[PDB]
Amino acid sequence: LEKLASIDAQLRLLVPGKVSEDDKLIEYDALLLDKFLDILQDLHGEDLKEAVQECYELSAEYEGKHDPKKLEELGSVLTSLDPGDSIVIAKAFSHMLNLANLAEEVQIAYRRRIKLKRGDFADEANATTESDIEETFKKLVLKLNKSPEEVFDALKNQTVDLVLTAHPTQSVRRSLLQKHGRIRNCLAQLYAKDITPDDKQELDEALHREIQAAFRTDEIRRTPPTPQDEMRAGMSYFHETIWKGVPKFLRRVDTALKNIGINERVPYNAPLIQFSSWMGGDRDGNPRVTPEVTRDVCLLARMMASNMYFSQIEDLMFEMSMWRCNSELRVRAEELYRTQVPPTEPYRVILGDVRDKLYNTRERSRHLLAHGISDIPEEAVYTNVEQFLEPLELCYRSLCDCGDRVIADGSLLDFLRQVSTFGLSLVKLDIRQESDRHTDVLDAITQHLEIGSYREWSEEKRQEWLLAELSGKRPLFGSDLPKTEEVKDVLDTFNVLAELPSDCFGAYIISMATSPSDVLAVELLQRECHVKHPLRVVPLFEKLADLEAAPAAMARLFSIDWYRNRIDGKQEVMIGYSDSGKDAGRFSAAWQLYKAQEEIIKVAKEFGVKLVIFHGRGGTVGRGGGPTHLAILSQPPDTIHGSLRVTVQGEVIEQSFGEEHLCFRTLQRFCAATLEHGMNPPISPRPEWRELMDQMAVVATEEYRSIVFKEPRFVEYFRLATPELEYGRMNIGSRPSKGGIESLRAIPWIFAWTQTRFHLPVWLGFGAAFKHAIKKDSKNLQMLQEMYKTWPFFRVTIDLVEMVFAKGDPGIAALNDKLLVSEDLWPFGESLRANYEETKDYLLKIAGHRDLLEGDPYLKQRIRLRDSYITTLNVCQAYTLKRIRDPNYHVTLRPHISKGLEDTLILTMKGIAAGMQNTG
Amino acid sequence: LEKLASIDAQLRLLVPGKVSEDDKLIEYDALLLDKFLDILQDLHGEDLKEAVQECYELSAEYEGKHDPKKLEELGSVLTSLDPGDSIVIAKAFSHMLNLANLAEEVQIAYRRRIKLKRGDFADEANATTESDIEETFKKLVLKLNKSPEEVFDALKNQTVDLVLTAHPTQSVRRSLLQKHGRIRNCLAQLYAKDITPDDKQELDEALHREIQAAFRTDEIRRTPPTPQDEMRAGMSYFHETIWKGVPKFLRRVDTALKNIGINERVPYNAPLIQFSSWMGGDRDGNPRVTPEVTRDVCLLARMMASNMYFSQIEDLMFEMSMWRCNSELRVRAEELYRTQVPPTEPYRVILGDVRDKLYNTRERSRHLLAHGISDIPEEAVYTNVEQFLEPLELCYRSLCDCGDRVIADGSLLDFLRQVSTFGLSLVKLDIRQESDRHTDVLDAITQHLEIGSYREWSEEKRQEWLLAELSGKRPLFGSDLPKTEEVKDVLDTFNVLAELPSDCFGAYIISMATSPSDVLAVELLQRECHVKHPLRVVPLFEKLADLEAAPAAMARLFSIDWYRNRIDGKQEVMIGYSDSGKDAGRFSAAWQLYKAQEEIIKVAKEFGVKLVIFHGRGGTVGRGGGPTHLAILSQPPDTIHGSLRVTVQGEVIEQSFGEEHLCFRTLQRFCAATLEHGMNPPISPRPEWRELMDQMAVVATEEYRSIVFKEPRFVEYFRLATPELEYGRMNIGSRPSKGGIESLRAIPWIFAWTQTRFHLPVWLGFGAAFKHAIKKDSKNLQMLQEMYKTWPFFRVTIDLVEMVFAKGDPGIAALNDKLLVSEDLWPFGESLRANYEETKDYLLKIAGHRDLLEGDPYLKQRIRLRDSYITTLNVCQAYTLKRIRDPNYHVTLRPHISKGLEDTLILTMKGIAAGMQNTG
Amino acid sequence: KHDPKKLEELGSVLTSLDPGDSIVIAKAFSHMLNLANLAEEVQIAYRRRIKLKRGDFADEANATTESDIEETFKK
Ligand SMILES: N[C@@H](CC(=O)O)C(=O)O
Ligand SMILES: N[C@@H](CC(=O)O)C(=O)O
């Protein structure tokens, strides 16, 4: 009848909880698990529930003592399941994990903020202590001597651009987030103080039902989804929380402003917040992302957006019942009426006409998507956001003129902000393609023209030629140009950019950029494919050597008159932490990128160019939560200067935007941190620190490279101990290599090692670095410790690695070796595990910590509560990999318990990924 | 800066408040007023705010001491306003009043229920103590020895039919209720314990803004709205609260059932709840309600309903992502797919097809409304509710078959209940017409045929003839029948009933019914106008003499074979409390109707007919709130027998259904009380009581009639002291007479006297009755007191009159006399006021009360808080009536203060009506 | 349930005690009873008075509804 107390007590044995009336995470997990076990019993029988229970207990005992025999006990239960039973159990543990995450969201959403606080930079690393927008304003006036008018001014001119990217292991379906949403809402509401008995009986029932609906929305799908479908799923968070969150956060900004003495509101059309997207735009090493895919996602964006505006304007129309207007609106209303509402309701006549334009904008888009042709003419549709804003501006003005500003400042204002923030699509699409592919197009052209081979030319020649053609008097090539399939694909992409309207797009990112010709090549292609409004061109520098030359590259570009004129004082450059870390190791990349950004800003300053750094995946700003706040504050001085552009990693998007409070705090912290930084850079490092970082980077890079690139048996080891081959072949997303580790892409590199709980890519090299700093001079420990206490960059860098170790378990990696790796390679695995421990030890000593995450007990608890579930998936995954790979491995199967191995593997890969979220 | 405390302290001086953490009404009023005064100042200037403040203080002092000089002080401020200033001030007091009412709704919504209670019938007269559905179940099992299975059974077979009617002084616009809704929601949320500082800053701002939006949604409209427009406005509460409230209440019933040991749910298609409507159907004394109007409202009903189902099914479709179905659904899905979703989502394929049918059903209806013709064929649309239910039943079954009943029992089940409760329209329309109009049609027919004059025939002849024609072999008349306009209008109404589908309609009510021929006449007309499925015919007995003969009338009908066969064991009869009270006075009508219902039930029993009493306006069941609960329990034994049909008076509908909690409790109490009564009738009166009531009724009727019909100067007095002539001429709704008071309609009779705060129609006759009972025999006081303590009917009857006196102020009626009535008629007014006081005194002594509403302090406080505002409107109204009626009356006007007299009068009439709500 | 066999079950456990054990058990139950009474006193001491009440003589039969001295004066 009542097992809720036993589940709760076994959880609390695993976590020494807390008295706080806000700490209820363990209660939430108990309740969710209890309901879930009941469901399992109802659907699959007591015996199956019992088996799930059996596996959980074994995992619990392992997370207690860490006796590795428990993993083999769990193994022998898991390997003895027919594949139908295995699927149900892998699905159970997967679902318990998701539930644990939902519980976490609710806990974070309602945790009390701390009132008394030091106001130093460590407060900015946690949701509970970080500065909200009013606190940041007040800090700037008080501690940095800014007039409120100055703070207001900075804020009006500030942009934060969040760039949405593909979930690496497939995005959750839109209907599943709504279910999740309802589970969270029922969970929140069962603990409200405001309500009675029966309401709770009903919430209990609602929650039970919703845990079940979620579990049975589980269709089994080896064959991937189209990039169009993956884009739709990625766009779900707009309907869920972003659409309302934006106006809600802007209203908070307004209140913060009243409270520091500024009586105005942020203008509705100040572009504080923008969203961009990569989904259907990034084709770098991904030929499923075709020209047609791009054309489609831009149409889908347009369709979704206008569908939202269409539906919202109906609500606005209800509200705008008022009859008093200025004469300017009167005139307009009467015109429209003369060409189905009364004229005594003038706002409704205007908004009704906007509604039809929006309906038209939406049907035109759908037609073009389904057929290429629409009977709906462009004249009857919105093609620029200002056409849509104008009549809304007219309403606003008319209301204020009549004395009803207060009304204008409600729903109408929310709407102006939505329109202005989201514009006609909800996101602008970046295109990304690798520079070789541009070279190939250009070599096809030069060879056709019989003037030689662009590939063979030196860099000085490439520039000389590209500039001569960018002011050429004469087109380069036609349709009759002989093209490989790949070259046709690059050209057809540019033709899409020419055809489609410029408000669909943002950046053309060049992967593997290294020279000025890389950027000039794209400028020429765009001009020659007749892109009337060329996308800005953004180089992505990947390797350490490429980051070293980046500054000179940008100096050259800027000193070219054509390009300088063309760029109109703005340039964006992209960095990719995971990418650079794959080349030199994480530590060395972190340092190089700090320096790279200082150096590129210096060069921009010199040429009078405004420089925007676009943060790609793997940086500490990608963590989400409080840690994102300190991460922003820790950027090098002047590297934001009013413009934050940052990747929202798909594996972090739910946590960041799925729950409405969290979404609000995410937007808040991006605005707060950006504003503060531009007026309050972090401390610049001491010379001694720089010098030590340079020495440490050399050593760190040497360790990492000698293991990852010069150990001849490394790739072999990697392919056995890691599910990277099976991630590739069951392709979850893109496709894994472009050869060895040079050839492998960042995401698969991280994912392979996250799946084994070993995380090599995040920590390798730090151990050599610290060890060597300290042997060289024992005083370096103190300096390292001081850097941790007082240099934000360094704090933040260590904290991310510390978090990754909290998600680590070398016991799991050892089990994979035992099962999957040949005995000859075992000492190699064991030395890599010795390196993990040694690296971890040094990290703890530098942070002044006895255990992992001592500074962040809330995060410690969250991670520890996930581990029981993830661990079962890991053991299941290891033995499933053994069965797939080795046909001659068999065990006695149990008789079927409930009422394909590849399917199990897909399920465990996604679960472990849902559990590990962000690492590097 | 802070006047909130002065407003609050001046209110609390007027009401000696309470410590209860739930009693916040006075705080709510303070806050709402403070924000409102600020708005007035911003929009109209300090001086205008000051004037409103000045008028409020004078009204406050009057409600304190009741010095009548204060009314003249207020008068002299009000009469000195140019008409533009007068409009703004009347609008201010009107808006403050509405605000006071919103505050009240919130107070009632969140007041704590009382846990310990006597469980006697007085507990059922208040929201805080009344029985909910679980308590009623438990009472029936425990105190009446019913098995839960029996209780379940009674409930499955029970119907409650709430019949929506026209607001007597015009329905609030749909957009204004939404605003109201938002003001309430902001008010509730400012006192939530669950939230922080800034949230409140924002709610403050939201509330201020919404009070302003409401104030400026105020267009000035002498020219009435069409009956179609008045029907649309009446239907607003479906979107607001009823649409969700129904499934929500049915789910509560399910929980109550689990909790008394019944594991089933009420079947989704048990018709526990139904709504009907009169709007566009009642034409009795109202020629604006034409055949075309009726045709229209049935189309609008159909349109609205299908628009709601269409929009809701989209949500349901999102939820129904599941892939497991039974084979029956599989087959169907694949068929539909073969004729735009994947087939792996079978519920969505079914629901999508339902969605298109719903869209079609909705466009067909709109076309027919706008043009008479639709290209959309009937085959592609729903014409019967079962066509719509079938595919939903299929989903339900399929889910249960696959083990997912728990899922079926969520949103799908809510939807089945909505569909089944609301059906294809949301309401079925009654038609009502007066019996003379039928006689005229029949006389036109007999004269045409040259067989004499139906009007001239006796009742025995009329029946003989109507029965001969109802089994006639030969049609009565054609199109070439010569018709007056009125006769054509009655025929064309029947032709509408023939053309339109039978699910649009319910009852054909015959006003002024008195004989069996009245009912047989309509049966014949329906047959001869070719109504394939005739509406049931329902007689409305109005006069005392008509109620006396009603039983014999029904005995005759039932003993006629044709009619008996035709009626298939069911008959509805309607009673109209206000109507009968206009003929004989309220007391005498109350008693007659108790007896009438006993007698008609007796006759039905004898003939084996199931009898449904339809309660028209003015009864104690129309009060709303707790009092509706005891009122139902107090019906005579066996007079409900599983079927409650009751009028929801337009002047009570906001209070009953505007706020979601109140809507839920309204549905609850109708179900609770109906179920209990059928198993637990009230005590039948003692013989001594009957005898005393008969003696008291004679005397009560004689007093009332001698004043209202035999005093030759009464009508003259009535037309001077009352705004009834101006209610008529500025027609707010219907139109006032059909002559004298016989000729005047109930609603205008009540409204005239409610506007003067005198309420003559509710209390007159009670005084003579009680006085005479007590002089005859001093022991009668004790018996009267005992009847009050132990006979529910009597309690409830006195309580309604007591409530009306709480809304009374003879000081106001005296002011009207002084200003509007000629001096010769002043002693007449003064004797009527002497009668008020004497009647009130006796009422207090019988109830054992020292002051009005001592038994109901919550209601006492609510009424007292309204009075300040209503009183200002009353004084304004009195002097405005003086100006309209007397051109030679003038006063010095103030210079204009802010930055038509008929308009002011409309405004004061509506305000006083919004303030007085229900009386008789 | 009021199954009378339970009294004899209890009997057979109680009659089988040496007199030293019997004393200690009778003393335990005696003390548990006193404890129960102390708990009752605390419950009655802090139970909330009921604000809304009929003001008839039945209210005077319970601590929670009876009239205090001010209510009696006012009455
Ligand atoms: N997003 C969290 C980690 C997690 O939730 O797994 C962080 O970066 O600290
Ligand atoms: N509806 C309330 C009266 C009112 O709210 O004015 C009642 O009948 O008691």
Curated annotation (Swiss-Prot), chains A, B:
GO terms for molecular function: phosphoenolpyruvate carboxylase activity. It is found in: Cytoplasm. The modification Phosphoserine is found at residue 6. It catalyses: oxaloacetate + phosphate = phosphoenolpyruvate + hydrogencarbonate. The keyword Translocase does not apply. The active site is at residues 167, 582. InterPro entries: PEP_COase, PEP_COase_bac/pln-type, PEP_COase_Lys_AS, PEPCASE_His_AS, Pyrv/PenolPyrv_kinase-like_dom. Belongs to the PEPCase type 1 family. This is Phosphoenolpyruvate carboxylase. The gene is PPCA1.
UniProtKB/Swiss-Prot annotation, chain C:
It is found in: Cytoplasm. It comes from the Eukaryota. Belongs to the PEPCase type 1 family. Homotetramer. Through the carboxylation of phosphoenolpyruvate (PEP) it forms oxaloacetate, a four-carbon dicarboxylic acid source for the tricarboxylic acid cycle. This is Phosphoenolpyruvate carboxylase. It comes from Flaveria pringlei. The chain holds residues 70 to 144 of 967 of the full protein.
